[PDB]
Design an enzyme around this catalytic site. Structure first.
Site, PDB file in Angstrom:
ATOM      1  N   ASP A  35       0.819  -1.207   0.000  1.00  0.00           N
ATOM      2  CA  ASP A  35       0.000   0.000   0.000  1.00  0.00           C
ATOM      3  C   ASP A  35       0.857   1.264   0.000  1.00  0.00           C
ATOM      4  O   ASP A  35       1.371   1.667   1.047  1.00  0.00           O
ATOM      5  CB  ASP A  35      -0.931  -0.021   1.217  1.00  0.00           C
ATOM      6  CG  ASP A  35      -1.832   1.205   1.308  1.00  0.00           C
ATOM      7  OD1 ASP A  35      -1.892   1.990   0.345  1.00  0.00           O
ATOM      8  OD2 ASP A  35      -2.487   1.369   2.360  1.00  0.00           O
ATOM      9  N   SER A 199      -1.131  15.719 -11.835  1.00  0.00           N
ATOM     10  CA  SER A 199      -1.423  15.349 -13.205  1.00  0.00           C
ATOM     11  C   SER A 199      -1.697  16.596 -14.040  1.00  0.00           C
ATOM     12  O   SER A 199      -2.228  17.580 -13.532  1.00  0.00           O
ATOM     13  CB  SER A 199      -2.628  14.392 -13.256  1.00  0.00           C
ATOM     14  OG  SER A 199      -2.984  14.119 -14.598  1.00  0.00           O
TER      15      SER A 199
END
Ligand SMILES: O[C@H]1[C@H](NCc2ccccc2)[C@H]2CO[C@H](O2)[C@@H]1Sc1ccccc1
Length: 330
Positions: A35, A199
């Site tokens: 994770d 992004s």
């Protein structure tokens, strides 16, 4: 040194991925959920409440000759889905795909919430976010990657998650045969303890690319792609019959639909998520209503590039003095 291990979807929907980890002496092999969104290595154990164990493989520290109780140390963690676990701490030897760390903090669960109990395929988590998020008290402990970093050939690990297929976590090296084209690197902020990046925008199917800054985290421990409400609305608007359902808890769509792809930007580069990656099957057994793999982040407080996005790429977690993230098509 290096390590390399195969990671496997736990079910037919790729809800999560498990990776075999060797713990203790002699080795006890547990299948852990790697994770990059948390920083605790915790495991089902001989100490876990019996009624809360249902099929999981457990760590038994009393049977490991290298296990040492970390005196006075406890841990307790909660995840975004309301799930939780807690217990005490041992240090022990931990190996992933041939890469070994001695004196790794192994957090032994005394309690786990029902969602962990109900998932027999996940024996615990191996956190790969930054050690600043580790919950061990009163002395914070380091992640497996942090402990291994100095010994690795290069201070990196990579995630290569498969769509309905096995994949790979590598440590210490970049497999240049595992991707196409080049790897585009992008800046990381560690201020929230995550692999947090920005992004450069998105496209829906064959639509024009929208240049817009989307701040989010690369998180292997989250199933879906969580993005701003505006972006998510633009996506599902291209699926006939798709609707946001309050009762279900997000966007659902007719299972007979053909899903458009979703593209996200990494600098000037583009990662294309195929439409079928976004299909998470019937909302309940036998239903013709399907659950969407792109959901709104509005009620989260952060955008999450979870498995739906990451499994479309070869992802480099670069743990150099200034960490960065790399994305390549594959
Ligand atoms: O994708 C889920 C993860 N469970 C995945 C899983 C599903 C089914 C079977 C196994 C594993 C855990 C970790 O964090 C949350 O719960 C995220 S969703 C989130 C919501 C708010 C904030 C952050 C994330």
């Amino acid at each position: 040194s290096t390590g390399s291990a195969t990671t496997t979807p736990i079910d037919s929907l790729d809800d999560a991925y498990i990776t075999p980890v060797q713990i203790g002496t002699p080795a006890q092999t547990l299948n852990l959920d790697f994770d990059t969104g948390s920083s605790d290595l915790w495991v089902f154990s001989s100490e876990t409440t019996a009624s809360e164990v249902d099929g999981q493989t457990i760590y038994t520290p009393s049977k490991s000759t290298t296990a040492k109780l970390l005196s006075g140390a406890t841990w307790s963690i909660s995840y975004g889905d309301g799930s939780s676990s807690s217990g005490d701490v041992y240090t022990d030897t931990v190996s992933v795909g041939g890469l070994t760390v001695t004196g790794q903090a192994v957090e032994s669960a005394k309690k786990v919430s029902s969602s962990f109990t109900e998932d027999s395929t996940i024996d615990g988590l191996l956190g790969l976010a930054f050690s600043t998020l580790n919950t061990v008290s009163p002395t914070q402990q380091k992640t497996f990657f942090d402990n291994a970093k100095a010994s690795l050939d290069s201070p990196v690990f990579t995630a290569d998650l498969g769509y309905h297929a096995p994949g790979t976590y590598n440590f210490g090296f970049i497999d240049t045969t595992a991707y196409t084209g080049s790897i585009t690197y992008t800046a990381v902020s560690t201020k929230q303890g995550f692999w947090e990046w920005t992004s450069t925008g998105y496209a829906v199917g064959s639509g024009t690319f929208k240049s817009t800054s989307i701040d989010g985290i690369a998180d292997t421990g989250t199933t879906l792609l969580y993005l701003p409400a505006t972006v998510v609305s633009a996506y599902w608007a291209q699926v006939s019959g798709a609707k946001s359902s309050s009762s279900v808890g997000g966007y659902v769509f007719p299972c007979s639909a053909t899903l458009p792809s979703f593209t996200f930007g990494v600098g000037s580069a583009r990662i294309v998520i195929p439409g079928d990656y976004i299909d998470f099957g019937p909302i309940s057994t036998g239903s013709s209503s399907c659950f969407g793999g792109i959901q709104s982040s509005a009620g989260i407080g952060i955008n999450i590039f979870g498995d739906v996005a990451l499994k479309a790429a070869f992802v480099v977690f670069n743990g150099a003095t200034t960490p960065t993230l790399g994305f390549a098509s594959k």
